[PDB]
């Protein structure tokens, strides 16, 4: 293999498993598929988000060997979050179920060795 890259990605990809398990799913559901503006009424979601995310999209990425490494799948995690955040009022209730879901993120990533 890229060895220890590909150790990494093998990781993130157990990561990914976890954040779409059912464990996690009270909290997970709506970051399961892409926003569906349309259908939530949202007429101005993709003139502020610039770059959607959503946890298929990065299952799609890995699969498909889009990610060279673990920092850049990261990176995708954190701008479905971040996506979220930016869009929403702070008091909203996607803004606290994407906080809950980002702390289990953060420490399971964190755990990865250097
Ligand atoms: C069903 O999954 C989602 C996922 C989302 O993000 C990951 C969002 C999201 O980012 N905002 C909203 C959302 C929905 C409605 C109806 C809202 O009121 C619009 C009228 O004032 C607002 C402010 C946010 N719904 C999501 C649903």
């Given at each position: 293999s890229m060895g220890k890259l590909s150790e990494q990605?093998?990781?993130?990809?157990?990561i990914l498993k976890e954040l779409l398990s059912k464990k996690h799913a009270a909290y997970a559901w709506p970051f399961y598929k892409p926003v569906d503006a349309s259908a939530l009424?949202?007429?101005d979601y993709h003139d502020i988000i610039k770059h959607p995310m959503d946890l298929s999209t990065v299952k799609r990425?890995?699969?498909?060997?889009?990610?060279?490494?673990?920092?850049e799948f990261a990176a995708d995690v954190r701008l479905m979050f971040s996506n979220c955040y930016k869009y929403n009022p702070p008091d909203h209730d996607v803004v606290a179920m994407a906080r809950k879901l980002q702390d289990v993120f953060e420490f399971r990533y964190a755990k990865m060795p250097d």
């Amino acid at each position: 293999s890229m060895g220890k890259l590909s150790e990494q990605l093998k990781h993130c990809n157990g990561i990914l498993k976890e954040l779409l398990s059912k464990k996690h799913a009270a909290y997970a559901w709506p970051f399961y598929k892409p926003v569906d503006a349309s259908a939530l009424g949202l007429h101005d979601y993709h003139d502020i988000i610039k770059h959607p995310m959503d946890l298929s999209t990065v299952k799609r990425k890995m699969e498909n060997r889009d990610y060279r490494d673990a920092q850049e799948f990261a990176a995708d995690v954190r701008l479905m979050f971040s996506n979220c955040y930016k869009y929403n009022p702070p008091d909203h209730d996607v803004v606290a179920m994407a906080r809950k879901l980002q702390d289990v993120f953060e420490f399971r990533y964190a755990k990865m060795p250097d």
